[PDB]
Amino acid sequence: AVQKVVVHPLVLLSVVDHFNRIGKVGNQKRVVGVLLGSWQKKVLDVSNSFAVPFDEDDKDDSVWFLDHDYLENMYGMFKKVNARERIVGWYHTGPKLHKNDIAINELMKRYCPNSVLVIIDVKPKDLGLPTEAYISVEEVHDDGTPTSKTFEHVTSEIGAEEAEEVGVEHLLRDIKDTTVGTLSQRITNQVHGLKGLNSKLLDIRSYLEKVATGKLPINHQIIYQLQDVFNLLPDVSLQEFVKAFYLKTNDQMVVVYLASLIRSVVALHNLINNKIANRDAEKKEG
Amino acid sequence: KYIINVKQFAKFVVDLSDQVAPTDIEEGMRVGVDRNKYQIHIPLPPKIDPTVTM
Amino acid sequence: KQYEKSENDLKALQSVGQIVGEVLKQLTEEKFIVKATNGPRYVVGCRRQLDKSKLKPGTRVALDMTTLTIMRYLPREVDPLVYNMSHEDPGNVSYSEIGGLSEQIRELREVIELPLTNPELFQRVGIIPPKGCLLYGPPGTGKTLLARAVASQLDCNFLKVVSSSIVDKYIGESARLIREMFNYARDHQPCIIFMDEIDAIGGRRFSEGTSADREIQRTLMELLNQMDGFDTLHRVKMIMATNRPDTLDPAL
Amino acid sequence: ENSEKIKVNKTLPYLVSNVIELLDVKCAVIKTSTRQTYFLPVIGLVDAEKLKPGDLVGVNKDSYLILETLPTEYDSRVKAMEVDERPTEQYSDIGGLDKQIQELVEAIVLPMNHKEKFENLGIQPPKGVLMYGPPGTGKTLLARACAAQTKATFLKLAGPQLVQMFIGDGAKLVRDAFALAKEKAPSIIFIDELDAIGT
Amino acid sequence: AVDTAEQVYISSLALLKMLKHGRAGVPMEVMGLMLGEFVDDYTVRVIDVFAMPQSGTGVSVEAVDPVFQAKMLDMLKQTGRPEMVVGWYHSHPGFGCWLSGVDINTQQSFEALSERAVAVVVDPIQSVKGKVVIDAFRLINANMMVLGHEPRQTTSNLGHLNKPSIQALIHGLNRHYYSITINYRKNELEQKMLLNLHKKSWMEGLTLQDYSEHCKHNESVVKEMLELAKNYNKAVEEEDKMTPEQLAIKNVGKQDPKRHLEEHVDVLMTSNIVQCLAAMLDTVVFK
Amino acid sequence: MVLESTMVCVDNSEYMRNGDFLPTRLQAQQDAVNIVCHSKTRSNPENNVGLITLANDCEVLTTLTPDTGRILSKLHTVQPKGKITFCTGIRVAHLALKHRQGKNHKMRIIAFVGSPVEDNEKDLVKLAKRLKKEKVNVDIINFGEEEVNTEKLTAFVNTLNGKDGTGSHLVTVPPGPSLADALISSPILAG
Amino acid sequence: LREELQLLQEQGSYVGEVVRAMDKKKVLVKVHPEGKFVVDVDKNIDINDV
Amino acid sequence: MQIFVKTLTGKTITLEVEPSDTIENVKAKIQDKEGIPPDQQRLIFAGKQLEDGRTLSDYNIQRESTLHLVLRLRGG
Amino acid sequence: EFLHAQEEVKRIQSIPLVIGQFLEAVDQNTAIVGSTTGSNYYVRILSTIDRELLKPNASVALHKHSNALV
Amino acid sequence: EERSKVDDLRGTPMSVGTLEEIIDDNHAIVSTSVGSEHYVSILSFVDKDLLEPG
């Protein structure tokens, strides 16, 4: 019953660290570590974490090794330095996940009952794509379909702390993106707010034409999850929109009509005071 | 478990340091209080004894 | 179990402590002017969900030690001088250790038990529910066991004032103790108040009287206006008890 | 490992204070001897059911945690009145007043010695005995010998010592003399020259 | 030997360990060890910083059993990468940044055991608005007090990177220790993704301001510039028609010029021209 | 003073739920672990012994550690109820020998086969040619039931250390009240 | 605006009432909450300031 | 015998001590060779704290043993 | 940069702070204020604070560190 | 030269103290202006002849 997780801006920096702590000699091209958290009531929080030596062979894709003794000491070391933080799960990077992630999860559920994984992106960082989290659930599948795992998605957000947010602003120092914007940042928030829109909409038809052909089998779960999108968008016809839209559009044109009136008197007064001061310095210089 | 006041700051429950012995320390006696750990370093006698020879 | 006691102390060890303060007024939607018990005055805010409408100008809150913003509000101090005036057992009696007084017992049970149980009999008749009564007479016939009887039956809240631990060396302490007493009694609505020996702070208010007795007169004038004054005393009834009902104030 | 971590983080320098009230929604308001008020969600080592308003607990200077309690403090005048451990005295030292001696042995020691001697009959022992008559005969000296043999934590009380200069001192002093008498269960109370405050 | 061109290279995830461990114990002076690498004589980097458990009070801080440190560094060799330590840190929450009594004693122990061992001071309760007062200091020997102390000007960039304030030069500067310059090792795939996750949005641009309080907010903006226009009518025209001094008390301590009356107009446009155009897209986009 | 990483590999398959011996096969294989962990202790205290299963999953119960008290707590209560899976058991043991804290120890893997193996001859020779290219010596000890002179195990011992290798002895115990006397004659010293 | 902001990030200054003091670049300043202090003069001011 | 005091700073200090010596002698030798007082030195042998009240033969310290030098960590 | 300085002055004042009293004014952009904890101070003021509001001993705001008339 | 070294050996913001009593062992008890009494040491260039209680 996880609503959402809160990833502090510290742990992903430790992943980017440990993505570079192995890349000098390692060709593993995935980083698997241990996620520590603070399960408060219903929302999940992640403050600190660490990593663990893990490898995986591409042949037979079922062989793995976790270091339990390093997990027992270092989590026990963190408990002594901070008896607030505890285990909440694990994490791995790489978009394409290997299939030992059920085998890793079902082992370390002996540590955490509500075990959770967090997928981050180190290289796919160009578009708007945050970190990703799933959940460990065990059902059959749907009704009469064969049994499997089916990691369900839990939505994720990012939240800092008081020093963890003020220390960020001192680091950037390049554009800094001020609060409430002066008509230039706000339009770009609608520009790149829409650049991610059709990128989702191109992605829907790409999976749809993949399954309209029939290569991969269908999932009925996504069908009605897509079907309530199209028969719940509004249709603007008469007396519910076209009356009520002008009632707030002809409302907001009255107050910008003051901006036409007031700002014209502002620059006119600055014109008068300069044309007085110009001709009076001119007539008295000679 | 010595209860000691400053009468300007507070009352403190402190201990003697490991330089003196818990033999001379009685009730109503000045001590040498550490500035940070507040420990009794050296006990002070209340200006003994210019009232016997006279 | 010994491990569970250890881990509770580990969670207890990571604690800060909070600055007790009182809200003076509200400046804006997020600016509150508070003040500590001796420290300066601050301009702080609330956390996330504190229901700022409950922040009345004169409540008591608990500030953060470092952020200094409001963590949790508190009802009221209860000034431990009167803490002992509530926590005591009367006699575990049940009107069976008393006799030969049933004409006066029931008449006292009439004036007290009805407003704290049965207000419908007082709405049907155009009368205000009454205030407290008085016990006077020679020493020996009840006067303490009778209040001990009624504080065993339906003890919602109870205060027993000795009327002789209420003054001291300090000249403005006496009337301050009475005001903070009734506010505890007012807040815990269905309370009953007992005061033995009204003769100790009674007296007729007379002329020039060697200022040690002037304080008792100023103490009594505070007791007058708190009983029947500007504040509508509701759900609070007062059993007064004396031994010589001759030298009391006619205004009392 | 946990008890070792409690021990090292337990510093010895404390700060005495006073509990004002105790709430549950466990929580206690603490006023220190620095004239400062503090509030904590969790008390700490001691229990919420063992405290009372008016205790001199040991509080941390920085985290403000109730570490130890052990108050046992009173007024200097009340502690001056605790007079015990006298040389003994026999009842045969008083001659001629032996009936009043037997009326004391039939008054005080058997409520103390044999409580089950009364609880089967259903009666309740009294608790007030007066010595009166000519001065200098048997008033203080009889109860001196009764406290000498039957040790029951003697506590004298003088008459004019209750009369202080300032207003509202004897009501403090008498009531503090009996809060000490209530906490010491085998203790007794002896009041002398009661006519000096007896109007 | 000693230069005046040293720059410590702290990482971004180093400094986030510094403020979080410093804000964790505020009234008890947290205390940890700083791990990095000496790449040459006079540039030192530090990327990952661990912490140590403490048992100290609000003015001094002690340590714990030293079987924790060597067991920690042994386990950090097999996981990630190994290093040797380059210094230490603490938190001075009350005052600013200067090295106390036992702070110089532990500095003498580390520069003799290890090589040079830069110490770092952090005020956790000062880094509040937008700025941090973190600084690093470094002990100088007392024997070379008749010649230069941080001598031998190689460059000229050592003057505008640090200007010691009056509260700093009274304790140890410059007769006891000296200060050292700090830059930030910022790179890619760490810094860009730091802002690709914090100050981002998807639907924030195409979302209405929920007119229950939008046009309600514009009531209390028109009425206050109404009063400023009441104030503006008399003010300028009376000042110009009585005395043409272009000066006093309407110059020295005033606030009602033509700077105050258009910024309320400036807020009222940006809050509404965006809000007008945000309700224009969904008429086309959403059928 | 030999520096190696001895990796013991017990079997908790379902076929261990019987006694062909007068004692329990689980008690027989448990005491087999006791006499080899005490063997590697007295020879050099600078080694490490770690247990690993292979039945239905190769769950790392204890990490390869120089302590023995963690192993002795976990040698008991193993609950053998799984199906034997041997082809992944070598690759997970070699993956455990790569994740070590020191790369100066030698490599020795002992395994306990208490159930018949049903594997392709290609799958054993690919693992055998892998360990030749990795220079890894694996000992194979048979428990309980055993087909005498198997094709798969004998060709795996041959293709392990061919052309004057180490001498990884194939222990063939007969059924009966014989204890690990066949396991302490040659393999406790001449492995 | 940067000039007003740079001097803003600076601690406050005390006040001390001085009626008379001594010479030799040391003056006698008595603060209000505490007692007197023998302090040093600045180089931007003179000494004849009694 | 010769010992290898493996410090935590990547520097191995070789000492010439005897098996019948104690810890205070090693601390004095380290102080004479460098300049660290004995009260600010914590010798660790295989994760075990060494006490000044015992000798080197009590902790099974033979020739060529790996030690760990930890200094007194305290700030203010 | 000018929009930076507007936001900097904006968030210099929205913080928890102490309350002192205005005592006196030296000249333009400098005053003498004393807090409620005794210990009369000497700080500088801002230009946003209107100078025609500070005749009496009025209630003012002060920073905890810079201690200025915020 | 020697006069300038000792005039700069002490701190510059010198605080006005108050003597209470004198012990002839290179230290004494003093009193601050707030009445806090500090068991401090006394130097040797202090010209120990005019030192009076008060």
Ligand SMILES: Nc1ncnc2c1ncn2[C@@H]1O[C@H](COP(=O)(O)OP(=O)(O)OP(=O)(O)O)[C@@H](O)[C@H]1O
């Ligand atoms: N009317 C009564 N009925 C039954 N018992 C009584 C009555 N009056 C007194 N008692 C007995 O007296 C004891 C209580 O004393 P009581 O409260 O009457 O003293 P008091 O009248 O309050 O004295 P004072 O008036 O001097 O305060 C009880 O033990 C009770 O048994």
Ligand SMILES: Nc1ncnc2c1ncn2[C@@H]1O[C@H](COP(=O)(O)OP(=O)(O)O)[C@@H](O)[C@H]1O
């Ligand atoms: N019957 C008696 N036997 C022994 N001593 C007596 C007797 N009567 C009086 N005294 C002496 O007289 C003294 C006064 O008695 P005390 O108890 O003080 O009476 P009061 O308290 O009324 O003065 C006692 O100290 C006691 O020694």
Ligand SMILES: [Mg+2]
């Ligand atoms: Mg009575």
Ligand SMILES: [Zn+2]
């Ligand atoms: Zn420090």
